[model samples]
Target chain A: SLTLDVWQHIRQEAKELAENEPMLASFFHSTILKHQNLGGALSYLLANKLANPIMPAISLREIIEEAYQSNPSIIDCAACDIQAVRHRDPAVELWSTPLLYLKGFHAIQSYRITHYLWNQNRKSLALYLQNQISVAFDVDIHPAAKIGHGIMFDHATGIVVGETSVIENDVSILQGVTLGGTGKESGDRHPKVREGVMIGAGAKILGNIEVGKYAKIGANSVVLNPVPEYATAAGVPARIV
Target chain B: SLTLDVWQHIRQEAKELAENEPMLASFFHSTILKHQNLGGALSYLLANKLANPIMPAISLREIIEEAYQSNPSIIDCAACDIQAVRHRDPAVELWSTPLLYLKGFHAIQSYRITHYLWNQNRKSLALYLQNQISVAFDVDIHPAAKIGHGIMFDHATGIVVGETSVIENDVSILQGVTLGGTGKESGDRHPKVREGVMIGAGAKILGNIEVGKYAKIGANSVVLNPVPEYATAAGVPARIV
Candidate 1:
């Protein structure tokens, strides 16, 4: 099946990329780090071995694809704009307020569909889907941004969007997370967000920096540079060591 | 219709109650603040103008009642205990973790159902529903605590729930949020959380206290007292202005 082949190809490519180009390797490693479904796989394997009732048929491959399609939050980049919606506000009414949560989920779904069209080089149809996603979800996510599934956006208030931004899935984001330009250069001025990243509230990710996968950014962290994989960042001008 | 009458009565009675029992009226007002559906109404209005769609008539009075029925988070006043499953660290793993994001969503939904039954004085039914929620969603939420809808729990990890606590809607909460009590007092011993409040990561709301609407609680704050509305609380005991 194409799914199996494509999965193998992606994994092999990730491994080779990691070994070949250190920089690109980090991106691929981050993708696997943040979006890998090892836990789910282990759960399934152990449950089957112990003859325990399996929870669901959601496999690791599916979960990984989901993260690949939508980008999970559990695997986060330390310098990315990862944030969750504020849940302690008593006056914050309406489940769909800020419009980002609604848009983020739906955008992921639509982006997946549009990616198919883009892969077929159906540029017009892909653009149409992009437009529809923007109008319906109020969040402008470029179809070209590689994303995985099960990516969650909590609150999703005041979230900025940009083209040429790559995101792997299984990532989680809170409100006020910005993925935008640094106002220094012109073309290709967006951040590449790897998978499984969890960003806290009010974090800004600027410039063409890469946020390593499976890293975390603390609330209100102003990130201006790249973060290493599996790192955690907090406070203003977020730092990762 | 019961909905219309309820809406009118609530509006009028609230106004009158504000004039007479000002404190009670204020409390109720603040309590109901998080359940507002202004965005839905506005969107409906705009959509109606554009599409001229034959809108289904709605009873203004029944809005709160309907919200209470529909949202699972609105259930009230029950003691909830969160237990983590084996082979999972809530702080790190997302998939194998029992009380993760999906569980939090289910907890909110179950809490609403429990609240609906509780309002009907079906305590057993409410408890049963809560049990089911825990079983199905892996998150336990008591039905007796007052809660508002449209609140978010992002990547809800290591979240501890307690009894007699009230949470208003439109609040945003991060991972490792605790709504807990100090020493066991047995009755009405939890915090009263107001609307539009945002509690940061690893924050603790302890004891018999009230957090006013639109207040912001910084990450890792340990609160033990009442906070006024529209205030920002942080640090131990959660200081306010």
Candidate 2:
């Protein structure tokens, strides 16, 4: 009965939000209340958003729903990410905003689906989803990148997570951030951002650098070097403070 | 007869591109080849991109088409933009790519329609178009901002252009750049970026400042002050170099 406070709050607030916002009633109804479970709602949106001339909405829904059936952990990951998004950002009062409206949340959640597909050796499908997510959501996280739970991509447009990048849990990444490879080497060239790291807007953590746990990277930093735990890194070639 | 080499080349490429890329044949046909003129193609995309539950695609198409007829200069501006997008960036060779694919171009083109509507005392509709563009394209340029021709928003996701901002001709803005207004004043705030300025990735040029013509802002620079013409500005709280 007490399994998901996340799903309960989102469904509860969606009804009130629909009532208050007269214009978005259709949006609120179709995206949330139409479905009984969290997986149903998420699958519906994935189908709807990714729909195009090649792949119609009806066809996409079945494909996505099938994925949900195969991997129920996808829902658990989404719930964790939503909780992280709500917990980190104060501007988000309702759980429903991230669930229905936030493209940042949508992109990352969809990325998880692609990630699961990638693990299953469905490489082409995974890549296609990655491209669609990039074009639709403007957040390009490569299918091969390893990302953990409780991640938030705030205003995520122009956020690029490169191949071989590893981002640990409880990380908050802001807009225009790049976990880029410097092309210094071939494999494992992207950043390994450890747990509890808050990267500010426009920060570029380039190369195979390791940003240790609990480090705060300031806005617009170009980090070429590694940062130890519990430190604040800021500037063009960000020196630790 | 030589009025639009831009439009001609795009039409020319759309055919070949459609042939080469099988998946996008329907997309190319619907978005480009089916339409007779540049204005028609542009309007179709604006409608297609903006259409949602509240606004049906057919209804949106009519409104957008009317806006194009009302302001023919809008087409001319788009032509200038396609040329700029091609000329400045080597990555974009075909005019069709920006018109048919790039969300940055789509966002700015739609913003022009909203800007025109904003000017003719159509505030509500203008604001609605602005909201739709922001949601669809992930590029939030306020309707009140005055922007000139040959402007490029390369990778433009998370690009926030504030109200009362003035961007002149031949400006190139990279991803995640914010022309934001500080709380120093209410009215007449925001950056006045002059012609020929190139703002690098994730640069935050804040306040009621003038980035003079031909300035180059390095990637991820956080600027607080006015930059003179022909200067290179870099770093956090960037001082001109």
Q: What stretches of model 1 exceed 4 Å from their correct place?
A: A1-103, A119-121, A154-158, B1-145, B148-165, B168-241
lDDT of 1 by residue, A43-107 (tens): 23222211212322243234324444453332222112111222222312222121111334334
What level of docking quality does candidate 2 show? incorrect
Off by over 4 Å in 2: A1-45, A52-54, A61-138, A141-158, A161-176, A179-202, A206-220, A224-232, B1-3, B20-23, B52-55, B86-94, B184-187
| Clash counts for the predictions, in order | 71, 0
List the DockQ of the predictions in order: 0.05, 0.20
lDDT of 2: 0.82
**lDDT (Cα, tens digit) per residue for candidate 1, span B1-241:** 3223323433454455557776576643543222343223222222222220111124222332454446423322110111121112245332212221245644664466456667766543344344334333334356677766555655554344555788875666776576755433556777888877888886767678888888888886767677788888885435664
Output the worst ten-in-a-row residue range by lDDT, candidate 1 chain A.
A77-86
User: Please, what are the lDDT tens digits per residue for candidate 2 over residues B99-169?
Assistant: 86667788888888888788889899888888888887778988999999998987667789998899999
lDDT of 2 by residue, A1-241 (tens): 3217788888899899899998998888888888787888888888888877556778767767777889777787788888898888999877877887788998988888878777876554565567578778888787789888789999887898877899998899998798865523566788999999999987988788899999999987889899999999998968898
Q: What's the distance in Å from true for residue B72, model 2?
A: 3.0
